[PDB]
Write a protein that binds this DNA or RNA. Structure first.
Lengths: 256, 592, 253, 236
DNA sequence: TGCGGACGAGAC
DNA sequence: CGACGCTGGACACGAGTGGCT
DNA sequence: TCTCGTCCGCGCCACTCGTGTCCAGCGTCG
């Protein structure tokens, strides 16, 4: 039996909205620490890890580890039912397969209980090692989403070269060639407009832009995105989920 | 047995009975043959079906053949045990799986793999998948392994004919079709009853297995070029043809060619070099379809440089060289040289010779060449008798049917659209004894031969000169009763036989054959049969379109029926002139 | 000779837009005192009833009944470009003359008149009689629209499950089963957001969620919608119309 | 190289949005006086005229006239990436195969740079009608719903003629509407292109429509007194 | 190869 | 609320493949 | 306008399917 109440239900709503496109069926690990996704897209080009720590969840309960294979499109449809305001506790069936999500309005008049098919998927863990990364970049999330959209209009692939001066996103295509570069602003106010970069070595990689646009769908979760890039190591874009957990997208470098 | 397996089994039996063709194979390929014979009837039927079908993976769902068995999984299992059929497990190539996938399924896979266009052209999606397969996974291998797995799961059970046994059977078909599956032979072959002849095989067209494999490669190259021509992919055609010419040049001094040079002319048309010369002729055809005409005339000069491959078509190449170098190129003095060589060439005959002559007289009359005088000299003179022209106004029915009706008005009630099959039919009927005659070497190889290989080759007259000359004189000086008996004898004895000369449906009844033979008379039939017996290739076409006769009058009118946009062909000009020279009354009918 | 003046042409705009997709090639049976409409759906499985009081319009003066041949899509594009604040007046001559509508914005800087021909029409006049309903529930129109648009994805049918304590819309489908419950409001404000259940006996009938979704299109017209349920009786989807009329959707469970 | 820096590049974005929908290919003629973009619509009925002056742009360098034929379908997407407050500059060398634009956000932290590949006599209109563009957009959309052609008349009348029904709208002077009414006007125009013209409205608060009998109509849009956007209507 | 359409090019 | 943009079912092609006794 | 010459598509047909276009329910954002 697994139970976890979330006051900020918009967190889970935007989580499922971000994850819907990449994964259609993913495994939701159940542990005292929290829920861990650790599933990858159908193309195997990209990988997403969703560690949602139990600290954020209120009244967190987990008798034993549960696989919770959830069809993420169906869960996205079910969560779209929820009001952004409504709290959501996920009541796992004791032994059967019916994730129950109940959404309750703050006004407490309306309660909305739904069950899920909760299918079973072949368990598979990538277990990527925690390789230290060079040229870590920290930039606003909306900015990165906009860069991905613009370059997706321009070209099919994006190449990223990072220096201590800045990080440069460039795409070349049939209709044109384009490049966008950002530099550490070091703003005094620093309401997450900071473009702070720590550099260790010059690293340049080329990445697919379809999956990168799919990564931008996690924008409402966090105002900031951290890009960490080391040569021959897949890009890491991470979204801190409201100080409750973290969602990270990995993307293997394009070869050409 | 159904028709397709019956055709296949007749082809296999005919090739197997040949000892030389069996020597041409390796022991393993004979193993494929004996395994093919070691199958159930449904197995053979399904193998022939899949063989006639294109060599691509075919879904088990789409394989629905009612005549073999309602459920064909046992048959596919038996064939894949025998080796001929490859199941989905041996489908480790991504491009093959993607091509096997249907457009809806490929669109579904594309969405799953997050392709650029989940909807679009099938080829574009396949190319995009091939691009995605080469990328790296986040495992840091191959991403295409997952693409392969998902595409195979989506395609479902699929089968494909193995290329080894397919090559064996394609080579068997080629060896059979040398003497001559094509649709005309795919169906009815079991029912077609061929003429009686004694098989005499003294000379070997192919020496080693490699020679037959090389011939098959050349034939496949020619077939691919011809298919590209038919489908209009002219640039792909040239690239295949150019490769083919490169291959032909690479094998220039191969020792097997030295004996191909010594094969007789009628057998030399079944060699690797012959098919490469035909490929070079198709190369000239594409060069001509393409804007380029300089490389075209260069290749015509190269082909013309050899007397030893394809001399029967030197008229075509001579006319094409003259035409290209005159109309398409400004220079005319080398045109004059080419024409004066062409009329000198003994191989140019009966219509292309007239075309070269007409080009020569045009140049002589044209003010452009009026300065040159060498053209006028040594120009052989063969003036062509003008033909009477009659114009008929009338009008949905075929034009020649309108001409038939018109001549029905002026008498001539009995009339058949021969289109040249009528005179070939009478030629076969009156000369079946010598066309199929025994004692000529290497001209009957298999029992499934519609025509002796000497036919359509100059050697047909030479090989049978005594008998052919004697019978041709006999037909010339013959009464009507004798000709009627002679035609009826072969219509009875060889009734239902298959000859490239005799079309049985051409004459509605044997009585019409008797009447037409009586009306044409002795000398006319003698002349037509003499012109068909010698150099049949250049005289088989252009015969008058309509033969008409009044039963009471015993008078005929070999009438060429041309529409308003139609013209007299060179072969037609020659044949009208020859028939006029024979005492026949011919006239061109124009119907507007 | 029928004249109608509607202070808020937006009311008739939403009426026609919401009722547009439900019934095609419908009929009009406007009375000498007020506007009354009723037609079966294009699939003839549901029913819609419209009523517009004469006194609601600023002016209203009509002489005889008329068929008033209607192409509701044509009327829809007519009420397009009509401002929400715009004043709309409908005047029509006799003998099925083209219905001419005049839209005058309160700014009065611009005024526009559009007339659409009445198309051949036939009046079948089913006239389904009115009857009492075992449970009537007053819920906000927006809440009901959201409830229906929500159960649409997860279910094809909606179980009303009304009770004195509250109501619970339950849906079962491929992606699990869902139930949203609205209790008795028990709210001091007595607002339109409150949900009140007037019922004498519990009832349970499943209704076509598709046609309910068709019904929710009238959400803009009414702050709250009363739903009336009786056993083996088509449910009533009633939307108040600015006190000027009442619109009801009749769907047989 | 030729540079046209635009401090408020939003209006450039908007005119590009209009012209991508209307015209397919066009060539930006650069003269030291300014940048003029007039070309022929892919459709026979209308042609369009965009005028930009050198003084309006912050920077204006032009030594050689370049046509710079550019497929506006691609160029609109290129300019779409620019923000509303983004500063838009166009740089093109006299021997440049591709025109280049650079986007700098107001905070100046982000810099963007994309390079994209490059390939009617005046008649005095006696009567002129000016109406709020949003308004004219509304008449265009409504009468395109009703029908396909509109007949315009003077005292401000737009009449809708469709097989469904008839529609008239009247505008009176009082955001401001002014009609000269120098001659009576009965000019009919196809509404398809009229609604293609409507897309241009976010650019100008007021639209100008001047009628002269059997004389082509022009929907001129005043671009903040910086330039003008003339779409030339050929009456049916 | 062997046909039926079409075109252009010259003669008129 | 709505003007506007977008990607997904539906339908007539044009092409390919196959059965042709 | 007429004629003469040259080039170009041509297995069979009927069944299923790729393809392009079309209309429209849904989603956006101001």
């Amino acid at each position: 039996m697994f139970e976890a109440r979330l006051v900020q239900g918009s967190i889970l709503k935007k989580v499922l909205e971000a994850l819907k496109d990449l994964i259609n069926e993913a495994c939701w690990d159940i542990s005292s620490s929290g829920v861990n996704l650790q599933s990858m897209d159908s193309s195997h080009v990209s990988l997403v890890q969703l560690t949602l720590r139990s600290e954020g969840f209120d009244t967190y309960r987990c008798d034993r580890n549960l696989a919770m294979g959830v069809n993420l499109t169906s869960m996205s449809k079910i969560l779209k039912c929820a009001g952004n305001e409504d709290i959501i506790t996920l009541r796992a069936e004791d032994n059967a397969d019916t994730l129950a999500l109940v959404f309750e309005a703050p006004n407490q008049e309306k309660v909305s209980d739904y069950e899920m098919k909760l299918m079973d998927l072949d368990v598979e863990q990538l277990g990527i090692p925690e390789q230290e990364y060079s040229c870590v970049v920290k930039m606003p999330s909306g900015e990165f989403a906009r860069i991905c959209r613009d370059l997706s209009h321009i070209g099919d692939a994006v190449v990223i070269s990072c220096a201590k001066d800045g990080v440069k996103f460039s795409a070349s295509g049939e209709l044109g060639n384009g490049n966008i570069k950002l530099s550490q602003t070091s703003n005094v106010d620093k309401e997450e407009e900071a473009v702070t970069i720590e550099m260790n070595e010059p690293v340049q990689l080329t990445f697919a832009l379809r999956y990168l646009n799919f990564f931008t769908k996690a924008t409402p979760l966090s105002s900031t995105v951290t890009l960490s890039m080391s040569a021959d190591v897949p890009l890491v874009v991470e979204y801190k989920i409201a100080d409750m957990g973290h969602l990270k997208y990995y993307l293997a470098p394009k070869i050409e | 047995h159904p028709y397709y397996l019956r055709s296949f089994l007749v082809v296999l039996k005919t090739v197997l009975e040949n000892e030389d063709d069996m020597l041409l194979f390796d022991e393993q390929e004979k193993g494929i043959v004996t395994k093919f014979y070691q199958l159930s009837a449904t197995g053979q039927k399904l193998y022939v079906r899949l063989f006639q079908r294109k060599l691509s993976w075919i879904k088990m769902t789409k394989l629905e053949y009612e005549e073999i068995a309602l459920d064909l999984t046992p048959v596919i299992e038996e064939l894949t045990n025998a080796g001929f059929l490859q199941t989905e497990s041996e489908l480790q190539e991504l491009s093959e799986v993607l091509e096997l996938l249907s457009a809806p399924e490929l669109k579904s896979l594309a969405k799953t793999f997050h392709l650029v266009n989940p909807n679009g052209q099938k080829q574009q999606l396949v190319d995009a998948f091939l691009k995605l397969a080469k990328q790296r996974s986040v495992c840091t291998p191959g991403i295409g392994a997952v693409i392969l797995k998902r595409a195979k799961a989506l395609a479902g059970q699929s089968v494909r004919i193995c290329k080894g046994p397919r090559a064996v059977f394609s080579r068997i078909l080629l060896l059979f079709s040398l003497t001559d599956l094509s649709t005309v032979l795919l169906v009815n072959l079991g029912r077609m009853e061929f003429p009686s002849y004694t098989i005499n095989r003294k000379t070997h067209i192919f020496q080693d297995r490699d020679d037959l494999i090389r011939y098959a490669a050349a034939t496949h190259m020619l077939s691919d070029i011809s298919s590209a021509m038919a489908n209009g992919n002219w640039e792909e055609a040239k690239e295949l043809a150019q490769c083919a010419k490169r291959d032909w040049n690479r094998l220039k001094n191969h020792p097997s060619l030295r004996c191909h040079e010594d094969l007789p002319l009628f057998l030399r048309c079944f060699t690797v070099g012959w098919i490469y010369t035909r490929i070079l002729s198709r190369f000239v055809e594409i060069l001509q379809r393409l804007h380029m005409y300089e490389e075209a005339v260069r290749e015509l000069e190269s082909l013309l440089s050899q007397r030893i491959y394809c001399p029967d078509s030197r008229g075509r190449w001579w006319d094409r060289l003259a035409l290209n170098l005159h109309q398409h190129l400004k220079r005319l003095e080398p045109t004059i040289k080419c024409i004066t060589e062409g009329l000198a060439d003994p191989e140019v005959r009966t219509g292309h010779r007239l075309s070269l002559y007409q080009r020569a007289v045009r140049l002589r009359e044209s003010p452009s060449c009026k300065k040159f005088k060498h053209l006028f000299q040594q120009l052989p003179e063969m003036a062509v008798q003008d033909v009477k022209h009659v114009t008929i106004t009338g009008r949905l029915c075929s034009v020649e049917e309108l001409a038939l009706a018109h001549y029905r008005r002026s008498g001539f009630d009995q009339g058949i659209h021969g289109e040249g099959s009528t005179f070939s039919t009478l030629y076969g009927l009156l000369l079946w004894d010598i066309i199929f005659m025994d004692g000529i070497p290497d001209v009957f190889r298999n029992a499934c031969q519609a025509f002796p290989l000497d036919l359509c080759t100059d050697s047909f007259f030479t090989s049978r000169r005594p008998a052919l000359e004697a019978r041709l004189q006999l037909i010339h000086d013959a009464p009507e009763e004798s000709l009627r008996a002679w035609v009826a004898a072969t219509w009875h004895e060889q009734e239902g036989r298959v000859a490239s000369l005799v079309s049985w449906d051409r004459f509605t009844s044997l009585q019409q054959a008797q009447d037409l033979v009586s009306c044409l008379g002795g000398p006319v039939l003698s002349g037509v049969c003499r012109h068909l017996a010698a150099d049949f290739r250049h005289c088989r076409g252009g015969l008058p379109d309509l033969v008409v006769w009044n039963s009471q009058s015993r008078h005929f009118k070999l009438v060429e029926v041309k529409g308003p946009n139609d013209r007299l062909s060179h072969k037609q000009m020659i044949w009208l002139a020859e028939l006029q020279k024979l005492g026949a009354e011919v006239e061109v009918c124009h119907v507007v």
